[PDB]
Amino acid sequence: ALFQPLTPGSREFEDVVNILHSSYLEPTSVTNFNYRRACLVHNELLEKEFTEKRRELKFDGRLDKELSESYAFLMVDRYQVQTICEKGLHVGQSKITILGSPSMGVYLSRYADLLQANPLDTGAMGDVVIFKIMKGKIKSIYDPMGVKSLDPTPKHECHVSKNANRITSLLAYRAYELTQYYFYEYGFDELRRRPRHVCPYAVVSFTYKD
């Protein structure tokens, strides 16, 4: 069973909602999102490869700090929750370029209230996939200023924007793109199309009221 529906008000339901509530860029976004349904994702194949990747990272010397699990988010269109939760998140599904080519990595939002470039419209409805991730050893990069962006940095698990903590407002210029995580993984001689240190964990449906 890939999806396990959770009953609203239950412990498991409020745990998933608590991941979202604790991950806002503006914690007062708690008044604007109503999470009306939620499922845990149980994809044994993806969880196997996440667990395998974590033990390889520890084999290659990453610190226990770098082995920690955290969460990141993706708002998903056209009822494609099914494909990402069953197949995993693949390269080429984002149009963001700020941290490297989307053909070489996958982009996830750091903040659960910052899921698209422009503000959400009142009454909007959406589906948000919650991924568990290992940021591992992070490569911090400056946003591009007339220079070609880097290929994914070998021996690091993701790219992040160097000064993203400067971002405090959902309306700051390019807040959405500057608060992304960029996950990638080199195979042997090729970039993997699906980084294994990203794994779908839960799905929620929301309505938005500003």
Residue numbers in the entry: 111 to 259, 269 to 329
Publication text:
HUSH is a complex of three proteins: transgene activation suppressor (TASOR), M-phase phosphoprotein 8 (MPP8), and Periphilin (PPHLN1, isoform 2). HUSH is a vertebrate-specific chromatin regulator that represses both exogenous and endogenous genetic elements. Here we show that TASOR is the central assembly platform of HUSH, providing binding sites for MPP8 and Periphilin. Structural and biochemical studies reveal that TASOR contains a catalytically inactive poly-ADP ribose polymerase (PARP) domain that is dispensable for assembly and chromatin targeting but critical for epigenetic regulation of target elements.
Bioinformatic analysis suggested that DUF3715 resembles a poly ADP-ribose polymerase (PARP) catalytic domain. Despite extensive trials, we could not induce the wild-type DUF3715 to crystallize. Hypothesizing that β6–β7 loop disorder precluded crystallization of the wild-type domain, we purified a variant with the Δ261–269 deletion. Validating our design, crystals were readily grown of native and SeMet-labeled samples, enabling X-ray structure determination of TASOR DUF3715 to a resolution of 2.0 Å by single-wavelength anomalous dispersion (SAD) phasing. In TASOR the key residues required for catalysis are even more degenerated than in ZAP or RCD1: all but one of them are replaced by hydrophobic amino acids. Based on our structure, TASOR therefore lacks the chemical functionality and physical space to bind the NAD+ cofactor. In particular, the loop connecting the final two strands (β8 and β9 in TASOR) spans 14 residues in TASOR (Tyr303–His316), compared to 5 residues in all annotated human PARP family members. In TASOR the extended β8–β9 loop has elevated B-factors in the crystal structure, and broad NMR peaks caused by fast T2 relaxation. We have identified that TASOR activity relies on an extended loop unique among the PARP family, and a single point mutation (Y305A) in this loop is sufficient to abolish transgene repression, endogenous LINE-1 restriction and genome-wide H3K9me3 deposition.
